[PDB]
Design a binder for these strands. Sequence first.
RNA 1: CUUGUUGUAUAUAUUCUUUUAUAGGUAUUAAACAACGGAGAUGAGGUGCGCGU
DNA 2: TGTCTATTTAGGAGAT
DNA 3: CACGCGCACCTCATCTCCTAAATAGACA
Length: 739
Amino acid sequence: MKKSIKFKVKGNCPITKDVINEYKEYYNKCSDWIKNNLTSITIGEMAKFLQETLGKDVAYISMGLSDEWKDKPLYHLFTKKYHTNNADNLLYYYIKEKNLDGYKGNTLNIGNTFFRQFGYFKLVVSNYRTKIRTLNCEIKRKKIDADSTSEDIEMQTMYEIIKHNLNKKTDWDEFISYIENVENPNIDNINRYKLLRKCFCENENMIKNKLELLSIEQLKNFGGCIMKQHINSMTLIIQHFKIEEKENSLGFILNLPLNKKQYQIELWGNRQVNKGTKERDAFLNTYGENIVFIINNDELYVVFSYEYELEKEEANFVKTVGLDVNFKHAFFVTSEKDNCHLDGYINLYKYLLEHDEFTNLLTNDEKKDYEELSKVVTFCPFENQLLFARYNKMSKFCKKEQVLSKLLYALQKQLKDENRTKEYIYVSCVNKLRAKYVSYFILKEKYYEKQKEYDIEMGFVDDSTESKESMDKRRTEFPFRNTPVANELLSKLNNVQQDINGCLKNIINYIYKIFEQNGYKIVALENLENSNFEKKQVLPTIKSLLKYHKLENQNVNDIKASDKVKEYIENGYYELITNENNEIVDAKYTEKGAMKVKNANFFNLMMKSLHFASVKDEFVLLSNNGKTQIALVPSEFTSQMDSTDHCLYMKKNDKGKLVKADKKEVRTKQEKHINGLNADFNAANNIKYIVENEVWREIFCTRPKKAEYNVPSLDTTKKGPSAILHMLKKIEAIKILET
RNA sequence: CUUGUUGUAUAUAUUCUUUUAUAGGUAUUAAACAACGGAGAUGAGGUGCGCGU
DNA sequence: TGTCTATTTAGGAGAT
DNA sequence: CACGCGCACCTCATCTCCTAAATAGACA
Ligand SMILES: [Mg+2]
Ligand SMILES: [Mg+2]
């Protein structure tokens, strides 16, 4: 495993934005040449031209004249079946002798080998590899249906070849024992694979021809790889350069050779590589060859690489804790009843209910659902409904929000004056996360409004919707992005999100070390993605309230009998400009409707703002150097399932086939689970059982493999959700919801 | 070189910002806890805005 | 006439 | 379900790459 360390240069360095810019321009010229000649030239022409121009017996010319590559397009040099260095050398020398990139030197007279050959050309080739190695016709990895449509069979044969990187029948023979010597082989699938082999034998040449045609037709007009105009980074791979420590200092020195002589760049020190540690030696002994020069905030940074010894522990399963992430009442609800035993732990829902100011404002049924959380180990009391009372002045939670904030900010000073640093940081970041999300909402809504205003004022007039050039030219020439107004908002938003990310990382570090210090050897999360987040419904927009919905200039007494629009007219969300006699003209958002839309956007924006899906990544990153490891479980299963009987609720479909139900149906009103427990406490106790029970563990997760970097100890299985269901019925852990 | 990046001060001043207002900008003051594999490219998705349907 | 720096070339992926 | 064409923003996924020896050229 290789890690990177970034240093900051001290003083003046010859590397500036001019050198980086010419590096980027060279990259773009070489990439343009490759893009133009990607499907036009043969490797044979290149190899022959170098053979007849220079004259040598090297291997990178022989490999281009070997009847395996002569009558092949240049894009085959970027595949994985071609030697990764012969292709580099052949392409480099064909480009160099013809001087196609337009190389005229570089500003600092950096060695051409370190700047052109293993500089921008190496990046060009590496980038074109990823494109062409990931260039394939996306076909479903499904069952071939045995003797299905001949078109289906032929596509199945060809796709599975590149799916498993096959070449010929020699690849099929290794596949035979692969499914014959496996537990529970799918005999029906094995017959399909037998048919796949049978049809492969007769029409193998047809497969090659179709594969060759499709790949070229997928690069008919690619446009090439382009280095963006904001990159501000150059990469040089130098074999012989020296990094030394500064004398009686914590800094370093980088003696790279500029213009046939060795320069000296002085670097600041890193606590990451602090003196006398076991990682400063790992750095100074095993550092790599690539040097990255990057400019961030008009300051130059140098990035190195070194070999690191991974030491991630193995799973233990002696102690386990679940953890559900749901952006409803508390962010992190875990699966341990709070009994005042976790050392260093602070419970904020127990703290808040001990003060009469907060409890008095709560109704009878709110105290009953706050006491539920005050007994469960929970983190980050992010109250979305209370938080929106900072943006909405005429709200009903405006008084609860102030008391909640006052108590939390008082705890923040109490913890600081008692010198409890970890808890103080946790609470301080909780407060700041709550404060920063409203700022992000404010700025994003202002960006939306200032885009609307700009586009209404400009009044871009374009023809019928057919194409890009067919549309107005002013759009590309004067886009909202390049307007100075929007350019500043996008920096304000970047800074706000930058604070949000750090506060979230601090909270997650608090949780991880809390569970590590006490003795827990696994933290179980679920593989959450953006689909789980239940978006609130935004009111239909005015521009499409009457145009799409066919309610444009329609009778006031009866516009239509659509029930949803009926509901929206029941309240005063919408205003309608009536005509002379019972029609519509225009609609304007009323105050209640506008604030309802804002409330719908405020809850929705936090799926992307607060990294709902990527919370698991922080725990996985912390697990690399920590004692406690992390297990991931399949999503869309734990929340609904009952943690008392350990079974899945389901509803009988019209056909009578059992259908797994949805979270909303298995949840009572008041957002409580029909089991009687909290909705998040229930899911946490489910995530735990899928890791505590050996029988369940093999169903949902994947087998323990050797430790890696940023890889969970237990990962979600690749088996399909339906396949999970059938195993979940083998163990009979299944129930019928209401029949 | 009591050293890099980010986070953590409801800290002191403000003729500042409603386009960060329990926060930030501009200058001072306090340290101590944490985490830290980077660069580039390609692709997918969501969201906003205009034009029309 | 050593001595440092820059250039050329590396062949033919397999087991999992 | 909004639909299509563009101007953008962000978040997320996946891939390449992080070498080493021999040799020629540039110096005093
Ligand atoms: Mg900040
Ligand atoms: Mg700092």
